[PDB]
């Protein structure tokens, strides 16, 4: 079976002599089927018996090209929970680099009631994880060898299906991985997210596999921060091939795909609950140039009444692109503008780069450099004593070593000092791969096994130190070779630590470019420097879905496209979709035509449609916020693939041009130039048009959805109750408004929903239980508002003043009881054609239990 051959010459075009040299098999009978492949027996074997331990078992593995092979390998397996299996493969005799991650070591006894069983084979070594309930083989290394050299470690697994989702950071273009022969390199790199499928800004080894239509799913995570590649083949099978550290694997079983994400996030860390304001709309560009220009853009979008919470300021606010300064001429009056923003209920987020100008003297001192030098907190060259010099925006630079706890002290004080001048509200950390305009350093990199390893994965440009730091550079956590992929992660950890001081008791907002597994505990993510093309629009959906799997649910691209002038039609469709990315920001590159919504004209279709859909986003913010609460507390996704709700239906398995907000809201954008319709899949559920309330005819079928220039498809799922709040142009204001309920009835006239409500900004409202959690349930004739947690009463005296019911016969004699005690008659408006009832003249106070009853 050619589909099962594991490639033995991953480094060069295949030849018989090399193959012979490697003791592999040769069979040149493509495309991509390996000509040279590992023999069926020629790997590691178990030495002696396995050893029962308290956590699981250990085995000793012994071996009979890419550096020193490790002769004796220790397998350590731990039955951590009923649904999480952990195994490490280490050097029996030498300690090796391991990621200094949230994840703690396991000091436990083996969990009870396992959903999985593990089987080890001895001659040759293989590891298999099967699901106990149906003996479905989930992990199975037997397809390939274990390879364990100092700078080349490889393990493969067969997969039980081709329903495979995950890996990053890349532009995959499709959400489902085909399992056609494909190699995905992972090594944090500043590169364009384009159709080339290169390594991008972040490193995410997690994948999820939907096993079958029952929903049974599993996930695999590799805890490894060295450059690596993930090799996919049609067996189906996946191979991990890394150039350092150890093979430290976790396997997660769930009954559903969402349960798999929850298991993964339980291990690596669930996402931060964002500030409610950060759910609003964000506007930004590279190079307004002057404060006057920035204010002009701010004012025209406010004039247009655009829902608009946050303004970002990019490196043009700085004095010559230097951190923690502003330009006293072009940005003269920045403090008064920040007061203006605040007074208008808006927030300022500032960009902050890691790299710190080293240009400092008696004449013109640069404080951040002087103070950081005093603290000795920079990344050093291999000599371990001289700060590494590279180049970024301000010129020659040194780079903070965020892995050193003293650096976060330095960093905090810098933000403290700057915040005294410019009262920013959130922080955008960029260029933190880390990105270097020179290769390695201003003196390049020394030739050695770190900078020039035996094997290099197929990373962009084919050198590790390309546009980053020397691999032999030295930080508190180790050498750059091992911790390069942790730069952005440690930076976000440190920036969150700074936020503890700058915004006491607040969440604030942190947006990061580079990430590692677990970055979502600290920061939001955006998909980087995209381009104003229809390709980039389409590619954004899988990227958003993937980051939700990764526990970074607040994710979005640069709406309308960073690079290039945006066509009006593309920007209009992108704003329409953009009103529904979990992170919604319009951002633009240097020099390009303006693409802020109001720049298209005060009476333009793009402005009108933008305002219209942003008003729907803001209306649905209580529902979106409640989704982020579930993501934070339980590990649920926010932007969700259809297959997560509809896995029983194999027509959902590669849908990637549509997605859900949580379980209940279906989003169908137009993603094709010139189009006024879209080919869409309608899952097996009752659906209601959001704007009209009318039940679609469609069910479990492909349709051509008619969507003119001012429309994006939005459908509400029957069985669900959506809390709403009357929109306004800021969430400061919107949070004071009356609330509503949209009850989308299922075929049985029933629905369920919930609402999380806290102060929208205090850190640890969830850990300290200072919040409201209520549940809504509808049966025929009755709505029940039930209160499950009631330790926060909003002092704005909020109430539900409207209930809209979809797919209903006329409700008559509506009664509102506050524990069996009625209170006068609400007004009911009924549309008998559309089957929509709207209950108004009602005053259901937030946090109070009610029963609303009717007859037919
Ligand atoms: O095309 S480019 O502008 O020159 O792209 C460069 C940066 O990634 C852009 S940064 C991130 C983006 O969101 C901010 O607006 C930009 C200013 O801080 C790379 O070329 C540097 O290697
Ligand atoms: C970097 O160099 C300074 C001396 O210049 C030293 O104090 C510091 O600990 C070094 N950092 C690392 C990570 O080795
Ligand atoms: C919206 O907020 C503005 C304050 O900017 C306020 O004047 C107005 O009353 C608010 N109205 C709504 C729709 O809540």
PDB file of C-alpha atoms in Angstrom, residues 94-245:
ATOM      1  CA  UNK A  94      20.515  12.601  29.190  1.00  0.00           C
ATOM      2  CA  UNK A  95      18.124  15.373  30.181  1.00  0.00           C
ATOM      3  CA  UNK A  96      16.793  17.237  27.139  1.00  0.00           C
ATOM      4  CA  UNK A  97      14.949  20.538  26.515  1.00  0.00           C
ATOM      5  CA  UNK A  98      11.288  20.452  27.480  1.00  0.00           C
ATOM      6  CA  UNK A  99       8.849  23.341  26.981  1.00  0.00           C
ATOM      7  CA  UNK A 100       8.648  25.409  30.219  1.00  0.00           C
ATOM      8  CA  UNK A 101       4.903  25.915  29.673  1.00  0.00           C
ATOM      9  CA  UNK A 102       0.002  26.477  32.498  1.00  0.00           C
ATOM     10  CA  UNK A 103       0.631  22.759  31.984  1.00  0.00           C
ATOM     11  CA  UNK A 104       1.994  21.212  35.190  1.00  0.00           C
ATOM     12  CA  UNK A 105       3.695  17.885  35.796  1.00  0.00           C
ATOM     13  CA  UNK A 106       1.455  14.989  36.772  1.00  0.00           C
ATOM     14  CA  UNK A 107       1.623  13.742  40.324  1.00  0.00           C
ATOM     15  CA  UNK A 108      -1.339  11.486  40.414  1.00  0.00           C
ATOM     16  CA  UNK A 109      -2.521   7.973  40.352  1.00  0.00           C
ATOM     17  CA  UNK A 110      -3.862   6.639  37.065  1.00  0.00           C
ATOM     18  CA  UNK A 111      -7.393   7.921  36.459  1.00  0.00           C
ATOM     19  CA  UNK A 112     -10.395   5.646  36.872  1.00  0.00           C
ATOM     20  CA  UNK A 113     -13.011   4.794  34.222  1.00  0.00           C
ATOM     21  CA  UNK A 114     -10.782   5.379  31.167  1.00  0.00           C
ATOM     22  CA  UNK A 115     -12.459   5.934  27.828  1.00  0.00           C
ATOM     23  CA  UNK A 116      -9.296   4.731  26.106  1.00  0.00           C
ATOM     24  CA  UNK A 117      -6.967   1.729  26.206  1.00  0.00           C
ATOM     25  CA  UNK A 118      -3.302   1.809  25.350  1.00  0.00           C
ATOM     26  CA  UNK A 119      -1.377  -1.086  23.788  1.00  0.00           C
ATOM     27  CA  UNK A 120       2.368  -1.232  23.382  1.00  0.00           C
ATOM     28  CA  UNK A 121       4.083  -3.554  20.907  1.00  0.00           C
ATOM     29  CA  UNK A 122       7.622  -4.486  21.460  1.00  0.00           C
ATOM     30  CA  UNK A 123       9.252  -5.775  18.256  1.00  0.00           C
ATOM     31  CA  UNK A 124       9.357  -3.188  16.780  1.00  0.00           C
ATOM     32  CA  UNK A 125       8.088  -0.532  19.186  1.00  0.00           C
ATOM     33  CA  UNK A 126       4.678   0.889  18.591  1.00  0.00           C
ATOM     34  CA  UNK A 127       2.066   2.735  20.682  1.00  0.00           C
ATOM     35  CA  UNK A 128      -1.652   2.591  20.061  1.00  0.00           C
ATOM     36  CA  UNK A 129      -4.578   4.370  21.775  1.00  0.00           C
ATOM     37  CA  UNK A 130      -8.009   2.874  21.120  1.00  0.00           C
ATOM     38  CA  UNK A 131     -11.420   4.087  22.169  1.00  0.00           C
ATOM     39  CA  UNK A 132     -12.741   1.557  24.678  1.00  0.00           C
ATOM     40  CA  UNK A 133     -16.471   1.736  23.727  1.00  0.00           C
ATOM     41  CA  UNK A 134     -15.992   0.653  20.097  1.00  0.00           C
ATOM     42  CA  UNK A 135     -12.240  -0.385  19.929  1.00  0.00           C
ATOM     43  CA  UNK A 136     -11.725   2.380  17.321  1.00  0.00           C
ATOM     44  CA  UNK A 137      -7.957   2.760  16.881  1.00  0.00           C
ATOM     45  CA  UNK A 138      -7.211   6.498  17.402  1.00  0.00           C
ATOM     46  CA  UNK A 139      -3.431   6.838  17.762  1.00  0.00           C
ATOM     47  CA  UNK A 140      -1.304   4.096  16.118  1.00  0.00           C
ATOM     48  CA  UNK A 141       2.439   4.717  15.614  1.00  0.00           C
ATOM     49  CA  UNK A 142       2.950   1.291  13.918  1.00  0.00           C
ATOM     50  CA  UNK A 143       2.716   2.853  10.397  1.00  0.00           C
ATOM     51  CA  UNK A 144       6.217   4.263  10.926  1.00  0.00           C
ATOM     52  CA  UNK A 145       9.390   4.197  12.995  1.00  0.00           C
ATOM     53  CA  UNK A 146      10.252   6.187  16.116  1.00  0.00           C
ATOM     54  CA  UNK A 147      13.258   8.275  15.209  1.00  0.00           C
ATOM     55  CA  UNK A 148      15.055   9.980  18.032  1.00  0.00           C
ATOM     56  CA  UNK A 149      18.305  11.805  17.203  1.00  0.00           C
ATOM     57  CA  UNK A 150      19.571  14.900  18.949  1.00  0.00           C
ATOM     58  CA  UNK A 151      18.193  17.133  16.103  1.00  0.00           C
ATOM     59  CA  UNK A 152      15.734  14.855  14.385  1.00  0.00           C
ATOM     60  CA  UNK A 153      12.762  13.267  16.203  1.00  0.00           C
ATOM     61  CA  UNK A 154       9.893  11.673  14.326  1.00  0.00           C
ATOM     62  CA  UNK A 155       6.746   9.748  15.272  1.00  0.00           C
ATOM     63  CA  UNK A 156       3.793   8.941  13.019  1.00  0.00           C
ATOM     64  CA  UNK A 157       0.176   7.929  13.749  1.00  0.00           C
ATOM     65  CA  UNK A 158      -2.500   6.412  11.523  1.00  0.00           C
ATOM     66  CA  UNK A 159      -5.807   8.279  11.762  1.00  0.00           C
ATOM     67  CA  UNK A 160      -9.309   6.712  11.781  1.00  0.00           C
ATOM     68  CA  UNK A 161     -10.738   9.246   9.308  1.00  0.00           C
ATOM     69  CA  UNK A 162      -9.863  12.146   6.980  1.00  0.00           C
ATOM     70  CA  UNK A 163     -11.995  14.551   9.079  1.00  0.00           C
ATOM     71  CA  UNK A 164      -8.889  16.309  10.366  1.00  0.00           C
ATOM     72  CA  UNK A 165      -8.851  19.987  11.526  1.00  0.00           C
ATOM     73  CA  UNK A 166      -6.088  22.059  13.110  1.00  0.00           C
ATOM     74  CA  UNK A 167      -2.315  22.744  12.912  1.00  0.00           C
ATOM     75  CA  UNK A 168      -0.938  26.241  12.567  1.00  0.00           C
ATOM     76  CA  UNK A 169      -0.189  28.902  12.032  1.00  0.00           C
ATOM     77  CA  UNK A 170      -0.823  28.625   8.275  1.00  0.00           C
ATOM     78  CA  UNK A 171      -3.245  29.600   5.553  1.00  0.00           C
ATOM     79  CA  UNK A 172      -4.702  26.139   4.817  1.00  0.00           C
ATOM     80  CA  UNK A 173      -7.364  27.583   2.473  1.00  0.00           C
ATOM     81  CA  UNK A 174      -9.718  24.680   3.284  1.00  0.00           C
ATOM     82  CA  UNK A 175     -10.714  23.872   6.867  1.00  0.00           C
ATOM     83  CA  UNK A 176     -10.737  20.095   6.461  1.00  0.00           C
ATOM     84  CA  UNK A 177      -7.290  18.600   5.715  1.00  0.00           C
ATOM     85  CA  UNK A 178      -7.726  16.299   2.611  1.00  0.00           C
ATOM     86  CA  UNK A 179      -5.024  14.038   3.870  1.00  0.00           C
ATOM     87  CA  UNK A 180      -3.465  14.207   0.414  1.00  0.00           C
ATOM     88  CA  UNK A 181       0.363  14.260   0.694  1.00  0.00           C
ATOM     89  CA  UNK A 182       1.220  17.571   2.361  1.00  0.00           C
ATOM     90  CA  UNK A 183       3.908  18.962   4.629  1.00  0.00           C
ATOM     91  CA  UNK A 184       3.142  21.926   6.961  1.00  0.00           C
ATOM     92  CA  UNK A 185       6.153  23.587   8.517  1.00  0.00           C
ATOM     93  CA  UNK A 186       5.769  25.246  11.952  1.00  0.00           C
ATOM     94  CA  UNK A 187       8.298  27.902  13.056  1.00  0.00           C
ATOM     95  CA  UNK A 188       7.208  31.368  14.094  1.00  0.00           C
ATOM     96  CA  UNK A 189       7.948  33.667  11.207  1.00  0.00           C
ATOM     97  CA  UNK A 190       6.993  37.122  10.022  1.00  0.00           C
ATOM     98  CA  UNK A 191       5.679  36.265   6.536  1.00  0.00           C
ATOM     99  CA  UNK A 192       2.607  37.055   4.484  1.00  0.00           C
ATOM    100  CA  UNK A 193      -0.412  34.844   5.001  1.00  0.00           C
ATOM    101  CA  UNK A 194      -0.786  33.908   1.291  1.00  0.00           C
ATOM    102  CA  UNK A 195      -1.518  30.960  -1.007  1.00  0.00           C
ATOM    103  CA  UNK A 196       1.991  29.545  -0.518  1.00  0.00           C
ATOM    104  CA  UNK A 197       1.135  27.647   2.667  1.00  0.00           C
ATOM    105  CA  UNK A 198       4.289  28.636   4.584  1.00  0.00           C
ATOM    106  CA  UNK A 199       5.051  28.728   8.319  1.00  0.00           C
ATOM    107  CA  UNK A 200       3.365  31.939   9.691  1.00  0.00           C
ATOM    108  CA  UNK A 201       3.426  33.870  12.969  1.00  0.00           C
ATOM    109  CA  UNK A 202       2.453  31.162  15.483  1.00  0.00           C
ATOM    110  CA  UNK A 203       3.087  27.543  16.440  1.00  0.00           C
ATOM    111  CA  UNK A 204       0.030  25.256  17.011  1.00  0.00           C
ATOM    112  CA  UNK A 205       0.527  21.471  16.944  1.00  0.00           C
ATOM    113  CA  UNK A 206      -3.017  20.541  18.006  1.00  0.00           C
ATOM    114  CA  UNK A 207      -5.322  18.741  15.658  1.00  0.00           C
ATOM    115  CA  UNK A 208      -8.831  17.339  16.167  1.00  0.00           C
ATOM    116  CA  UNK A 209     -10.183  14.302  14.285  1.00  0.00           C
ATOM    117  CA  UNK A 210     -13.930  13.596  13.920  1.00  0.00           C
ATOM    118  CA  UNK A 211     -13.929   9.742  13.876  1.00  0.00           C
ATOM    119  CA  UNK A 212     -17.405   9.198  12.378  1.00  0.00           C
ATOM    120  CA  UNK A 213     -20.934  10.610  12.117  1.00  0.00           C
ATOM    121  CA  UNK A 214     -21.790   9.634  15.722  1.00  0.00           C
ATOM    122  CA  UNK A 215     -19.643  12.604  16.831  1.00  0.00           C
ATOM    123  CA  UNK A 216     -16.918  10.593  18.616  1.00  0.00           C
ATOM    124  CA  UNK A 217     -13.779  12.628  18.148  1.00  0.00           C
ATOM    125  CA  UNK A 218     -10.255  12.808  19.468  1.00  0.00           C
ATOM    126  CA  UNK A 219      -7.371  15.258  19.486  1.00  0.00           C
ATOM    127  CA  UNK A 220      -3.593  15.120  19.583  1.00  0.00           C
ATOM    128  CA  UNK A 221      -1.226  17.719  20.961  1.00  0.00           C
ATOM    129  CA  UNK A 222       2.586  17.737  20.766  1.00  0.00           C
ATOM    130  CA  UNK A 223       4.268  19.769  23.501  1.00  0.00           C
ATOM    131  CA  UNK A 224       7.392  20.761  21.488  1.00  0.00           C
ATOM    132  CA  UNK A 225       8.667  24.250  20.663  1.00  0.00           C
ATOM    133  CA  UNK A 226      11.483  23.348  18.180  1.00  0.00           C
ATOM    134  CA  UNK A 227      11.142  23.967  14.431  1.00  0.00           C
ATOM    135  CA  UNK A 228       9.105  21.145  13.010  1.00  0.00           C
ATOM    136  CA  UNK A 229       6.890  20.000  10.231  1.00  0.00           C
ATOM    137  CA  UNK A 230       3.684  18.053  10.132  1.00  0.00           C
ATOM    138  CA  UNK A 231       3.463  15.616   7.247  1.00  0.00           C
ATOM    139  CA  UNK A 232      -0.007  14.476   6.135  1.00  0.00           C
ATOM    140  CA  UNK A 233      -0.589  11.442   3.888  1.00  0.00           C
ATOM    141  CA  UNK A 234      -3.612   9.524   2.394  1.00  0.00           C
ATOM    142  CA  UNK A 235      -3.188   6.365   4.510  1.00  0.00           C
ATOM    143  CA  UNK A 236      -4.596   8.476   6.326  1.00  0.00           C
ATOM    144  CA  UNK A 237      -1.744   9.319   8.613  1.00  0.00           C
ATOM    145  CA  UNK A 238       0.061  12.198  10.252  1.00  0.00           C
ATOM    146  CA  UNK A 239       3.798  12.398  11.063  1.00  0.00           C
ATOM    147  CA  UNK A 240       5.485  14.928  13.411  1.00  0.00           C
ATOM    148  CA  UNK A 241       9.114  15.627  12.546  1.00  0.00           C
ATOM    149  CA  UNK A 242      10.892  18.049  14.952  1.00  0.00           C
ATOM    150  CA  UNK A 243      14.548  19.096  15.252  1.00  0.00           C
ATOM    151  CA  UNK A 244      14.841  19.327  19.004  1.00  0.00           C
ATOM    152  CA  UNK A 245      13.473  18.666  22.462  1.00  0.00           C
TER     153      UNK A 245
END
